[PDB]
Design a protein around this ligand. Structure first.
Ligand SMILES: O=C(O)[C@@H]1C[C@]2(C(=O)O)C=C[C@@H](O)[C@@H](C2)O1
Ligand SMILES: O=C(O)[C@@H]1C[C@]2(C(=O)O)C=C[C@@H](O)[C@@H](C2)O1
Ligand SMILES: N[C@@H](Cc1ccc(O)cc1)C(=O)O
Ligand SMILES: N[C@@H](Cc1ccc(O)cc1)C(=O)O
Ligand SMILES: N[C@@H](Cc1ccccc1)C(=O)O
Ligand SMILES: N[C@@H](Cc1ccccc1)C(=O)O
Ligand SMILES: [Cl-]
Ligand SMILES: [Cl-]
Ligand SMILES: [Mn+2]
Ligand SMILES: [Mn+2]
Lengths: 452, 79, 452, 79
C-alpha cells in the first residue's frame, strides 16, 4: 500500500554561494540519519523541483516583524507539536493547533500591549535528535517520521530515505491548510477569544483567569465600538536533517537585492542543543541562509560561546535575524541566564531572547512515561522574566510544545493531572506536550508577567 | 444621625482587616523564600487554587480578593 | 464699538410645509423674547441667507447613529456649557470643552463596550428660560446672550434683537473650530486618554479611578498591537427662540427623498421643561423639522403625557428620532421613572432614554450661589441605571453641563469643593457646571455603571 | 517539610479575614438602607475616598482591596 514518484531527468548558484554552501555541508554534522547516500540523493532530486513550502517575500516579512521583537516592540510566540507525525497530519489536529496558537496570541497580545508574532512548530517538524541510538526496548531509536517509524518493531526503526518526500508532501499539505485557516473566519480575534471565554467557563481553574479573560473581552469590544472589524502563522521546525534542508534551498533576490539562499521548507528554523557545533555544518548552514534562525542554549552555555554564535549567525547586525532560545530549567535560569545576557547585549547585537521552559524540565515519571510539571514550566518563564526585568532587557518570547487535544502528557495545571493519569491520553510521539487547557493557562500566566 | 455608630464598627473592621492582611503578606513571603531555599518554585499552582476557593463564599468578588492576597504575598508574576 | 450688517434686498416651501410650519408658529410659545416684531423680522432676513451651521447629510447621519442608541447598541453623551456666552466664545474655551467631551467619550466607550455618540451643548446655546421675569437684584432677567446681557444693569437686561445675528456669527465660528479640532490630532484616542491618565496622576481621587484608566490604556494599546491607527462632535442647543430657529430652517431632500425641513442651527435640539406645551408652538415646530429632537421630562410627568409626546414627535416610528431626557432628582427618579418607561416602551416606539442629573438637583447655597452636590448627581444617574436595569430597557445616555475649566460651581467630588469655595471660580453665566475634574469623575463612574 | 506550620497560620488568617469581611459587608449594607431611609444617596463619595485611604499602607494594591470591600458593601454601581 504505497504511491510512487518519478525521479526527474534549478539554476546554478553564484560561485560564492556554491562554495560557502559546499564548504558548510563539508563540515561534521551530528545526529544525521544513516541511509544510502545514493537513495538520499534520489530524494533530494525530487525535492529540488517541488513547489516550495514557503516563499522568500514571507521570510523577509517575518524578518521585519522579528526585528520589532528584537528591539523590544513585539513578542514572539512559538508553539506546536513536539514531533509531527504523518499519522496525525489531519485537519482536526491542524485546526486545533492553529486555534490553540491563535488563542494564546490574543491573551499574550493584551498582556504585552504590543504585537505578537505567531510561529508554529508545524509543516516540517518531522525529525528529532536522540541521546542514545538504542531505546528502552533495545530497539534502534525513533528519530521522527522524516527518518523512521514510531512503531516499536526492528523493521520500523530502520532509516528510510523515502520519508524525505513523505515529509515534504505532508508539510505542504498542512501548510496549505494553515494558509486557508488563517485567511478564514478562524482568524477573527472576537471568534478566537470566545473560545477562551469557553475555557474559563469549563475549566477547574476558571476563577484564576476570569478577570483577565473579561478584561480582554472588553478590549475586543472596545475595538469594535471604535469602528474596527487576517492572521499570520509562520512555519518552523528544527533544521536537523541536512539532506532535507539542502533540497528545499531556493535562490532569490533578498533584503539587499543581491541573490541569497532561502531555505523554503519553513519560514524560520532553529539548531538544537545536540547540533550547535560552532564549527559544525548545522551552524554553518545557518550562515548561508537568509531565514531567521535560532539556537538552543542549555545550562552548559558560556557567555563567551553565546557571543560567538551571535557574531557568526548575525554578522551584519540585522536585529531579529538571530533568536537565542534559553532552556536551563527553573532552578538554573535565574543564575545562568544573566551573565549570558549581559555579555551578548554588550556586543551591540539585537537578539531575540526566547524562553523554552520545556526542554530543561523533563523528568521520567514513576509510571514509565516522561513528563513535565506545570509548576516547573511556569517557574522558568517567571524566572526568565525576573532575569530580564532585572537587567532591563527584553523578554522577547516563549517556545512551547502543545497540542489542541486534551492529552494527558504534563502534570499539574488546572486538571491536577497526576502521575497515574499520564497513561490515559499520552498521544505524543516524543516529548510531553501541554494539552490545550495547560496551553491557555500558561498564556494567561505569561500575559500576567508581561503586564508592567 | 446614629449612622456613625457603625461607621466606627466599619472603621474597626478595616484597620483590623488591614492588620490581618498586613501579616498574611509576610507569612506567604516566609513560605516564599522557604520553599525557594531548596530549589523550589516561586509559586505553587494548586495552592493558589486553594486560596481562591477559600473566599468563594463572598461570591464572584471572592476570587479577586483572593488574587489580591496572593499578589501581596508572592508578588506580581514576572517581577 | 460695533460692526454692521446689511439687510438683504431662498426657495418657497411646498404648500404643506408652508401650512404646517405657519400652523405650528401660530400656536402659543412660552418664554419667547419680547422685542419689536419688525426688528426681529430684519434679523431673520439676514439669517435666512447666511451659510448654515450644519448640513442635512450630517443630521441624517446622526439620526442613524441615534437609532443605534435607541436600539440598545450605542450610548449618547451630551455635554457642554450650560449657557454659551459671546464673551467666552474663544479657542481655549472651545478646545477645553471639546477635549472634555472627547475624554469622557473614551471612558464611556470602554465602559459601555459600544459606541458613544458625542453631542455638544455648543454653537447655539445662547438662550435660556427664566422662571421669574425679575431677578435677585430687582432687574429684568438675563435670558442668555441671544436675548440680553449678563451684565447687571437695567440697560444690559433689555432684549436686543440684534443678538440674533451676533448669536449665529458666534455659533458658526465655534462650529468651524469644532470641525477643525475633531479632524486634527486632538481627536486621536491615544492622545485623548493620556489627558485622562494625567488626571488620575494629578487628582486627589486618582486611586478611585486608576485601575480603570489603566484598563483603558491597555485596551488602546491592544488596538495598536492588533494593527489599528477622526472624531464626530455634533452641535445642539435648546430650541427656545423660535425667531432664531425659523431663520435657520432650510429645505432639502431627506430620509425619504421627498423635501423636508431641517433646522440647520444645529444637528439636534431639545425642547425644555418650561416650553413643552403639548399643543404649543415649540412641540409643533419639532414636528415639522427632520432633526433628532429631545424633550425634558421633570417630576410632574405622567406616563400618559410622555406617550403623547412619543406619538406626536415620533409619528413614523423612526428609532432614535426622539430622545426623552429625564431630570427628576435622585430622590424621585427611582419611583417616578419606571411607570413612564413601562408605558412608553409598551407603544412599540424606540426612544432614547437620556438621563439629566443636573436640572433636578439644583439648590441655592448658604453663600448666595446656586450649586449642585456631586453625590446627588451620581445618585440620580445611578438611580437612573438601577431603574432601566430592573425593567430590561436601555440606559441610553446622559446629558451633563460641564466646562473644560477648573471652575468651582458644583460641590463635592475629588476636590471636596465646599460652600466657601463656590466664590473662587464661579464663571458660569447660568447654572453650576461641573469643572473638568468632576466631568471625568462622573464619566468614570457612569462607565462603571455601564459595565455588566 | 516544616512549611506546613505557616500553611496553617495562612489558613487561619484567611478564614479569619474572610469572617471579618463577611461582616463588614452587611455593616455597609446597614448604613446603606439606613441613609437611604431618609431620602439619602446610595453612596457617599468622600467616604469611599476615606476607605480607599485606609488600605494605602498596603501599597498600590491597597486601593484595589478597598474597592472590593466597597463593592461588597454598597454593591456594583448602576445595579
Ligand atoms: O505556597 C504557599 O502556600 C505560599 C502562600 C501563598 C499565599 O499567598 O497564600 C499561596 C501559594 C503560593 O503561591 C505562595 C503564596 O506561597
Ligand atoms: O456611608 C458609608 O460609610 C457606608 C459604608 C461604605 C463602605 O462599604 O465602607 C462606605 C461608603 C458608602 O459609599 C457606603 C459603603 O456606605
Ligand atoms: N539544492 C542544492 C543547492 C542549490 C540550491 C538552489 C539552487 O538554485 C542551486 C543549487 C544542494 O543541495 O546542494
Ligand atoms: N425661514 C422661513 C421659512 C422657510 C424656510 C426655508 C425655505 O426654503 C423657505 C421658507 C420662516 O421663518 O418662515
Ligand atoms: N499523512 C498521510 C497522508 C498524506 C499523504 C500525502 C500527503 C499528505 C498526507 C501520509 O503520510 O501518507
Ligand atoms: N465673541 C465676540 C467676537 C466674535 C465676533 C463675531 C463672530 C464671532 C465672534 C462677539 O460676540 O462679538
Ligand atoms: Cl517571492
Ligand atoms: Cl447635504
Ligand atoms: Mn520537544
Ligand atoms: Mn443648565
Amino acid at each position: 500500500m504505497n504511491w510512487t514518484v518519478d525521479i526527474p531527468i534549478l539554476p546554478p548558484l553564484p560561485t560564492d554561494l556554491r562554495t560557502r554552501l559546499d564548504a558548510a555541508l563539508a563540515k561534521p554534522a551530528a545526529q544525521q540519519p544513516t541511509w544510502p547516500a545514493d537513495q538520499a540523493l534520489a530524494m533530494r532530486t525530487v525535492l529540488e523541483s517541488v513547489p516550495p513550502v514557503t516563499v522568500p517575500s514571507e521570510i523577509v516579512r517575518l524578518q521585519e516583524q522579528l526585528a520589532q521583537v528584537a528591539k523590544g516592540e513585539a513578542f514572539l510566540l512559538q508553539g506546536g507539536d513536539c514531533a509531527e507525525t504523518f499519522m496525525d497530519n489531519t485537519e482536526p489536529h491542524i485546526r486545533g493547533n492553529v486555534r490553540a496558537l491563535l488563542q494564546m496570541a490574543v491573551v499574550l497580545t493584551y498582556g504585552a500591549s504590543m504585537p505578537v508574532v505567531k510561529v508554529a512548530r508545524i509543516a516540517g517538524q518531522y525529525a528529532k535528535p536522540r541521546s542514545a541510538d538504542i531505546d528502552a526496548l533495545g530497539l534502534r531509536s525513533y528519530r521522527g517520521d522524516m527518518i523512521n517509524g514510531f512503531a516499536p518493531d526492528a523493521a520500523a526503526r530502520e532509516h528510510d530515505p523515502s520519508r524525505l518526500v513523505r515529509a515534504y508532501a505532508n508539510a505542504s499539505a498542512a501548510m496549505n491548510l494553515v494558509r486557508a485557516l488563517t485567511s478564514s473566519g478562524l482568524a477573527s480575534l472576537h471568534l478566537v477569544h470566545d473560545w477562551n471565554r469557553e475555557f474559563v467557563r469549563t475549566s477547574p481553574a476558571g476563577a484564576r483567569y476570569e478577570a483577565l479573560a473579561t478584561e480582554i473581552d472588553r478590549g475586543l469590544r472596545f475595538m469594535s465600538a471604535c469602528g474596527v472589524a487576517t492572521a499570520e502563522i509562520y512555519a518552523s521546525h528544527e533544521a536537523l536533517v541536512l539532506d532535507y534542508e539542502r533540497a528545499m534551498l531556493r535562490l532569490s533576490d533578498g533584503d539587499d537585492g543581491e541573490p541569497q539562499l532561502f531555505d523554503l521548507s519553513a519560514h524560520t528554523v532553529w539548531i538544537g542543543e545536540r547540533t550547535r557545533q560552532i564549527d559544525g555544518a548545522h551552524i554553518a548552514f545557518a550562515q548561508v541562509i537568509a531565514n531567521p534562525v535560532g539556537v538552543k542554549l542549555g545550562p552548559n552555555m558560556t557567555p563567551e560561546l553565546a557571543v560567538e554564535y551571535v557574531e557568526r549567525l548575525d554578522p551584519h547586525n540585522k536585529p531579529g535575524r538571530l533568536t537565542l532560545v534559553s532552556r536551563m530549567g527553573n532552578h538554573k535560569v535565574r543564575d545562568l541566564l544573566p551573565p549570558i545576557v549581559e555579555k551578548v547585549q554588550a556586543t551591540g547585537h539585537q537578539v531575540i531572547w526566547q524562553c523554552d521552559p520545556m526542554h530543561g524540565n523533563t523528568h521520567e515519571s514513576s509510571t514509565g512515561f516522561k513528563t513535565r510539571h506545570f509548576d516547573r514550566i511556569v517557574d522558568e518563564v517567571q524566572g526568565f522574566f525576573e532575569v530580564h526585568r532585572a537587567l532591563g532587557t527584553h523578554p522577547g518570547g516563549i517556545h512551547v510544545e502543545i497540542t489542541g487535544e486534551n492529552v494527558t502528557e504534563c502534570l499539574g495545571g488546572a486538571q491536577d493531572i497526576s502521575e497515574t493519569d499520564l497513561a490515559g491520553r499520552y498521544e505524543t510521539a516524543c516529548d510531553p506536550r501541554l494539552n490545550t487547557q495547560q496551553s491557555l493557562e500558561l498564556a494567561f500566566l505569561v500575559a500576567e508577567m508581561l503586564r508592567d | 444621625p446614629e449612622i456613625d455608630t457603625l461607621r466606627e464598627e466599619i472603621d474597626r473592621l478595616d484597620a483590623e482587616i488591614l492588620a490581618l492582611v498586613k501579616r498574611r503578606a509576610e507569612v506567604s513571603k516566609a513560605i516564599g523564600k522557604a520553599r525557594m531555599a531548596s530549589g523550589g518554585t516561586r509559586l505553587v499552582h494548586s495552592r493558589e487554587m486553594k486560596v481562591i476557593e477559600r473566599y468563594s463564599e463572598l461570591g464572584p468578588d471572592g476570587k479577586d480578593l483572593a488574587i489580591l492576597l496572593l499578589r501581596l504575598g508572592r508578588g506580581r508574576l514576572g517581577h
